[model samples]
Target: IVGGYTCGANTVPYQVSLNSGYHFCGGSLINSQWVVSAAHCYKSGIQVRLGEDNINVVEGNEQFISASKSIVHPSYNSNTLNNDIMLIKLKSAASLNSRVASISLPTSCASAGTQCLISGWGNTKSSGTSYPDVLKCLKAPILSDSSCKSAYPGQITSNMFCAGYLEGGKDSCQGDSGGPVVCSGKLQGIVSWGSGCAQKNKPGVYTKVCNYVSWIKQTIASN
Candidate 1:
């Protein structure tokens, strides 16, 4: 996360790191047995680590589990990045505590200018490679759909929304995809893609979580 700070211990209890021997993306624990992430981050045999503040250290609060199943949205489009959301069933239910808990789903859609919290282990720079071992977080505001469309003309979709400063300096980068963009203590967005790490007129685009609440509940109920 560019221009962000390290999150305090248990600050983001729902945060989970998607890994295959290395941190690749971030996710949020929606329940004891389910995690929500970006469809593009899907890969077989993903390991989910929860209660993690730093990836470099093995904190006793962490819970590591293998993904039992990965279900991407049926209407997901790789080319357009539409409906870029996915659900992962945990092999076993997570033990919730102060350091590990499920985040509540958003009750309403987030409007433009609403401040949200985005946390992940993505890159710290737009050019060189620098994936922080510690979880970094940024406070970014939701941009209007029209503003987002103007920034990435013919690219933004209804299932996607943009967040962060238009002037640049803060964003969720490569490794941050699939992470959480929470508003008012509820899950509102999922880090999906962006033009760059944190470039002017190119804010971080996220999967609009509000648009998939029904799908998420139905998927979890049936599967």
Candidate 2:
């Protein structure tokens, strides 16, 4: 995340790094075997690395579990970037511990203006190439639907929401997609897309996780 602080080791246990051989995206561990991330990050040969703080270092608490399979939302539209959420089933269940655990999903949507936590290992610069080795975090307040619509005319959808400062400083950039946006400790949003990393009138857009709780539950239960 740009203009953010470094999150200490194991501070965010539910955060998982989506990797094949290198970190690419971030995901939230919703359960022992299920991880919720962005559908755009979905691909073959993905490995969910749990309990990861610094991607460059082998902290010894990390669990590298390959994805057995993934289920993308049927309504996902790559063009419009709607319904971008997806679920990845781990080849084996992750052993929950102090450094590895599940994050609870929100039952309802977060109100506008609610301050939420955004964490990831994405770019720390907006117009430069820089990715953090350690996890970075930022506090971005959720933007109202009207404001978000105004920011990106005809782009914001019910399945998507915006969060970040309008003046532009902190935001989730490249390699941060599918990361966690937690509000009140509940998994509320998934990093999806934005105009520019962190620009004026252009807040970071995310997948509205609250709107898909039923879908997530049904998909997990039936599968």
Report, for every candidate in turn, its global Cα lDDT versus the true structure. 0.93, 0.93
Error of 1 at 40 (Å): 0.4
Model 1 lDDT per residue over 168-223, tens place: 88888999999999999999999999997889989989999999899999999999
What is the lDDT for 128 in model 1?
Answer: 94
Task: Give the TM-score comparing model 2 with the true structure, all chains together.
Answer: 0.98
Candidate 2 on 1-223: residue-level lDDT in tens?
Answer: 9999998999999999999889988999999999999999988899999999889899799999999989999989999989998999999999999889899999889999999999999999989888779999999999999999999998988888999999997888999999999999899999999987988889999999999999999999987
Q: What is the lDDT of residue 198 in candidate 2?
A: 87
Look at candidate 2 and give me any clashing residue pairs.
Answer: none
- Score candidate 1 by lDDT: 0.93
